[model samples]
Target: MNPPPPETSNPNKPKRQTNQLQYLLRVVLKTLWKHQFAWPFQQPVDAVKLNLPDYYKIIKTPMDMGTIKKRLENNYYWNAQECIQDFNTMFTNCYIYNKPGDDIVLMAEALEKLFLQKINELPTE
Candidate 1:
């Protein structure tokens, strides 16, 4: 028996959607990078330079937008969820390592909310 090729579904559309998500992820990352409060979350923690010796002890799997951007450029996270998980890890580390009284924590909250909002705003597929 011969199998019929897709017509209404447009078999090629899935490929396009995958590319669309990748493109959107980059666009979202660009926004996250440019945001003023984003400065703190852009780079990885410099334990010695930043005087965060305890960071490594608390955040075993540290993350940042710079790392995520590098991974995006390398296509390390072919799936958006994996990339998003890195963002989640970054925010969780911020909350855990920094003091709530510190403005960096506040910035982290804003940046996290901004990222979540932008990613959620994308196509709900």
Candidate 2:
């Protein structure tokens, strides 16, 4: 698939509330690209309701799930070292300023890795 489109011009809009806990969550997600919890997919459960395979079986877009799975399924997927480097690059490049020391990025990356493992712990159907 083609590379992801450019990021939105207005990446972060002003929040309506000021909850420290929420801010912390944002930081972690940005830093690690991992998510502690699955994003609530109330609208299109297909993306978050079934397993990856099942989801792919029914869906067509990779953007819905980002590059996590596609990268792994490839013949030249990132090895341990590469994954770590990519994670570090992602950390400093995309998440560092977005959410400094934020656990949300950690959580998001963890969830991505977790899905890579279980792939079924959280459904996408």
Candidate 3:
């Protein structure tokens, strides 16, 4: 016989917000990439400098904002790969799917802002 649906249900089971937020943001990011990220592939290198948000998108990965800030504080140059690695470690280690969907969205927004701010703070030539 099929086992009864989980008894008492996990009425209080914390929801999976990270996965939801990730899904939602992934969609937004993809849209931005389509409108912004795809332009360069069609245009010549001399066309124009890529927009900041798109450039930031290219450089982003699952990296922690704090780690990137620390690294950048020590040195100004931005390194996307390292930042991505740091973010991946940070999320995977602690906050990934750590709360309900709404909460995850809030956290994700905050983290994205923090990450972007850190990247933006780097000095340029």
lDDT of 3 at 77: 24
* lDDT by residue for model 3 (7-35), tens: 22233443232332332234422332344
Task: Supply candidate 2's per-residue lDDT for 117.
Answer: 51
lDDT of 2 by residue, 1-125 (tens): 13332222222432122232232224422333344344421112232434333433433332322332223233222233332343344323324323544664565455556534532222221
lDDT leader: 1
- In model 3, which runs have C-alpha deviations exceeding 4 angstroms? 1-64, 76-78, 102-105, 113-125
Query: Clashing residue pairs in candidate 3, if any?
Result: 62-87, 62-88, 63-87, 64-87
lDDT of each: 0.71, 0.34, 0.36
Error of 1 at 80 (Å): 0.6
Candidate 2's TM-score reads: 0.30
TM-score for each prediction?
0.78, 0.30, 0.28
Off by over 4 Å in 1: 1-17
User: Each prediction's Cα RMSD?
Assistant: 12.5, 17.9, 20.1
- Residue 121 lDDT (model 2): 29
Rank all candidate structures by their lDDT, best first, as comma-separated numbers. Answer: 1, 3, 2
Model 1: lDDT equals 0.71
For model 2 the local lDDT of residue 93 reads: 37
